[PDB]
Structure 1
């Protein structure tokens, strides 16, 4: 109501320099009126704007046109300028959004998951007819269907057709707003609201970007029985970015003195490891690497065209039947922006992004995955070996270049994937075998395993030793007493500790830490013994692992709130790396990086000269199908390749890739 009274109040309200700067630019067709200036002029005008939002916006449409034709400010070209509201007094959420806010102006914070492309849309659809000069005007909504007169109003010629000359054409883009992961506690599911973007709101942001929208919550498809008003539409009026501190955590100045008190506290590194998951006993090397992955290194920028990452991805291979997820669940309760998902995330996009079909509009819609919504935070994924085929192709770009490049028809994106991935992949067999390599018992590709900085083998006790005896006593205290399960630093205080270090503390390497890292690198590279000739030579350490040693060294200085990296942080990072390189990535006595190629260099030297003696017996043709399999294995045992077992297990991986196939039983030839 009082629609005519709202025009005169908005004309007296219309701050003037922002309108004067608006007419100098041609593409900008919207003024951003703040709500605090509206409450200072007339609070009843602001109160009427909330209950009746459509008539008050239209009252702001024509009243700014009278000000545009004022004797002080007169412009001959008078375009309808939309009114934008900056900061509403109440900031709603998607989880607390209900049916009361329909036809009510609201301010909803959230994160974009779906996006659509730019498509035209008719606002005022006029219809002309043949054999008669009658016309008819009809207005339409983007959520509503295009109405169609069955007959003409004058005579009913059944020739109603849309003319595009006098119709007003606008742009249309539908996006979806979901709840933010940093504001969503575990055990809750994020709700979704399908919104629309009109002429000025088109291409406001990207999927995986957190925005703060103010708009009228419209509604559509209110079928009596066919459909119970299932569809809701947030007609977005003004958009901005809520990353302005509001997204940041609530770090108190009282708690900030408690954070700096932990830095002065002795054995804070030992205190953080004991505080991170004290319910599960043991795995202190795994708890140190998880704590080193919770903090990060400084993302140094190079002018050459790349950016050095500071994310330390840690994959926990482990064993099936051990806990393997309580470390994931407690860290997701502890890490900021953590999204605890599985390998089968029950979504069409998965962990990476994908272009899917939308049910609301037949156009194609790009969905953002788990590695896009968790940007700037953590993405803890369980069952990482069971991952989709499209996700297996984009996992290499998401962990090196921190981007997911997906191309569709009219949809192209380079969505950022700066997520520290704490993954966990079960082996495909029953348990991990110490006599076999790590990628040979894993479904992950070899190039994906080299993307992770630290790999920890969470293997159970092989016998009932003293390690298994004290593992029993802690579980009786945990279940029956519940007195030694409290951490030295509580979960709410440690969550404020990690986010304070990742935001404020940015350490730099010193000359003593540079000397320790350089000495360890040239000592490991000199440890290689040249024991093989005419074949592939093993490498003790790759310079990719040198960049991982720097990131673990800067995370140790960030762990105790230090702005410099000494040699104690370097020596701690070397001991974690040296413990990592002895359990995984180890040929017989040579600590070889087998992760880069899933097989050892001695295994490649065995398999290449096995195919070489398979080739020279194929041209010689001792058998009828070239080289016999019986003749090629006794010459391999003569040449020193091995027994009748390992050559037989070497040839099944030859036919699986196509290197050396078998025509029949007792015959084998190379391709």
Structure 2
């Protein structure tokens, strides 16, 4: 017989994880939460088969009500004993079972409280529809689960004695009775799982265009024909920030990214573009990161001091002092095929910097702690904000002098954007006018060419394209690299940092991202020139005192 499952959805209200009360146990209800841990899909004993131990005849299709049960009927006439059975696992019938742990959303968390978690069980077709690091709405029944944890808690815990009033007894001689504790914790059994976007508001393009309706395809293609599409995109990135067009260009290219290539040797070429923003205090560097985490899907925002090496990559966790160990995904795993925004990168200690650059080269995270040996994917881009030594950016020193990050950190960043604070009357006047206008006017002081929804739609469309270099593109790229090297050779110490082969690879990656921005399958020499110009004005000239 087939097992049928009814999934209910579109409940009128969704309840917060802290609104769960004991009155709703056994009732259909909807919750929302962030998936932090997911388990292996496991078989659950739905309809077991037993054999009576002394009858030794087979029986089947005995329903299981949560915890494991044994029948006491035994319709075989051979026995007179009900309790003694054995269970065979082969003839039994099983079901999909997955336990996924969800957490309170950030906006749902009260004023001083810590986030609290909930274990929700998925069965049947609903399994594997929840992924770590996304916001999911679960519709299901609030169930109750036995819990031995509550033994030391204050208060009277309910117990369960067997009642002995209709049992005749004799004091013949030769007084023991069994009592069990009724201690429970609230869990959820979800029949329906839907994944809300982690943002505030599938590689093949043919799959993606089929999901969109024809009308929305019409505005998508309408954005495609626009000859000034690049200018609209770079102005639509972070409208709260005034100025800084180069950083917006780099952030747009980071959201687009490059293609991932592998040689015949087996080495992998990274398509992710890493951006680092360094400069004087209060130059809106954190505004870029807050815009990216609120806008880009599969993006996390971390602080350098508040992070940890296990919290950034992956952690092996002891649960309830039980012999099992688990893995919870760190920040870079939650931002896989996304952007990890690390604010205050200079404040991160050296051990976490080592543990994160291991993922920066290897694109993977190795776990060998205790009995767990695993390799995990860390294909994530990094958007970092750093402060120079002493607060202000020193014009006299180089880029390596200002930054406390290691050379393995510094070499893998494709772009370094140094934002300097200079006091000019005009630029300060329009900047102050813009900021006070924001404070006065709220949303309507923000006027991007594209809304956030259509910008995400265009980026998701553009990520499907895989640009390839042309014959003229390779020659122009080689000549541009030679010009970069000759410029550093003439500059000597006036350059912030010297061009190596890695900057040529970053220029290739940026040209691929620019070709993705214009939705073309072939890279134009003009796109390579634009990537060259972006990387060129990324580097600033070091001032030298007169002799």
- Which category of TM-score, normalised to the shorter sequence, fits these structures? 0.5 to 0.7
Provide the residue aligned with 1:544 in structure 2: 502
1:508 pairs with one of 457, 468, 483: 468
Question: 1:292 is paired with a residue of what secondary structure?
Answer: helix
* 1:110-121 map, 5 Å: 113-114=36-37
Provide the residue aligned with 1:194 in structure 2: 119
Aligned-residue Cα RMSD (Å) equals 5.2
TM-score by length of 2: 0.68
Contact 2:468–2:523, Cα closer than 8 Å, also in 1: yes
Cα distance, 1:518 vs. partner?
0.8
Cα distance, 1:499 vs. partner?
1.4
Provide the residue aligned with 2:9 in structure 1: 90
Cα distance, 1:437 vs. partner?
2.6
1:493 pairs with one of 440, 448, 454: 454
Contact 2:35–2:101, Cα closer than 8 Å, also in 1: yes
Question: 2:312 is paired with a residue of what secondary structure?
Answer: coil
Provide the residue aligned with 2:101 in structure 1: 177
Question: 2:388 is paired with a residue of what secondary structure?
Answer: coil
Contact 1:406–1:412, Cα closer than 8 Å, also in 2: yes
Provide the residue aligned with 1:415 in structure 2: 376
TM-score by length of 1: 0.56
Cα distance, 1:353 vs. partner?
0.8
Cα distance, 1:390 vs. partner?
5.3
1:232 pairs with one of 156, 180, 187: 187
The size of the alignment, in residue pairs, is 463
Distance verdict in 2 for CA 1:237–1:369, change over 3 Å? same
Cα distance, 1:527 vs. partner?
5.1
Cα distance, 1:362 vs. partner?
4.9
Q: Could you tell me which runs of 5 or more consecutive residues in structure 2 were left unpaired when the two chains were aligned.
A: 49-63, 69-85, 110-114, 158-181
Provide the residue aligned with 1:577 in structure 2: 535
Contact 2:233–2:252, Cα closer than 8 Å, also in 1: yes
Distance verdict in 2 for CA 1:219–1:281, change over 3 Å? same
1:324 pairs with one of 279, 282, 285: 285
Residues 254-294 of structure 1 show CA distances to partners (whole Å, capped at 9, x for unaligned) of 22221221222132211111111222211111111111112
Residues 328-368 of structure 1 show CA distances to partners (whole Å, capped at 9, x for unaligned) of 22222322222233334578942211112223735322221
1:454 pairs with one of 387, 392, 415: 415
Cα distance, 1:295 vs. partner?
0.9
Contact 1:215–1:236, Cα closer than 8 Å, also in 2: yes
Cα distance, 1:395 vs. partner?
0.9
Question: 1:262 is paired with a residue of what secondary structure?
Answer: helix
Question: Quick one: distance in 2 between partners of 1:451 and 1:496?
Answer: 29
Cα distance, 1:103 vs. partner?
4.6
Contact 2:396–2:543, Cα closer than 8 Å, also in 1: no
Question: Quick one: distance in 2 between partners of 1:587 and 1:144?
Answer: 74
1:472 pairs with one of 432, 446, 456: 432
| 1:435 corresponds to 2:435 | no
Provide the residue aligned with 1:41 in structure 2: none
Cα distance, 1:432 vs. partner?
1.3
Residues 138-166 of structure 1 show CA distances to partners (whole Å, capped at 9, x for unaligned) of xxx9x999xxxxxxxxxxxxxxxxxxx99
Question: Quick one: distance in 1 between partners of 2:441 and 2:192?
Answer: 57
Question: 1:366 is paired with a residue of what secondary structure?
Answer: strand
Contact 2:510–2:531, Cα closer than 8 Å, also in 1: yes
Question: 1:336 is paired with a residue of what secondary structure?
Answer: coil
Question: Quick one: distance in 2 between partners of 1:418 and 1:382?
Answer: 19
Larger radius of gyration: 1
- Greater RCO, 1 or 2 (C-alpha within 8 Å, sep 6+): 2
* 1:578-657 map, 5 Å: 578-582=536-540
Provide the residue aligned with 2:262 in structure 1: 301
Contact 1:115–1:366, Cα closer than 8 Å, also in 2: no
Provide the residue aligned with 1:310 in structure 2: 271
Question: Quick one: distance in 2 between partners of 1:587 and 1:406?
Answer: 46
* 1:341-420 map, 5 Å: 341-345=302-306, 349-359=310-320, 361-387=322-348, 391-420=352-381
Contact 1:88–1:107, Cα closer than 8 Å, also in 2: no
Question: 1:468 is paired with a residue of what secondary structure?
Answer: helix
1:263 pairs with one of 224, 242, 262: 224
Question: Quick one: distance in 2 between partners of 1:315 and 1:220?
Answer: 48
Distance verdict in 2 for CA 1:348–1:221, change over 3 Å? farther
Question: 2:450 is paired with a residue of what secondary structure?
Answer: coil
Question: Quick one: distance in 2 between partners of 1:265 and 1:197?
Answer: 46
Cα distance, 1:573 vs. partner?
0.2
Question: 1:440 is paired with a residue of what secondary structure?
Answer: helix
Provide the residue aligned with 1:596 in structure 2: none
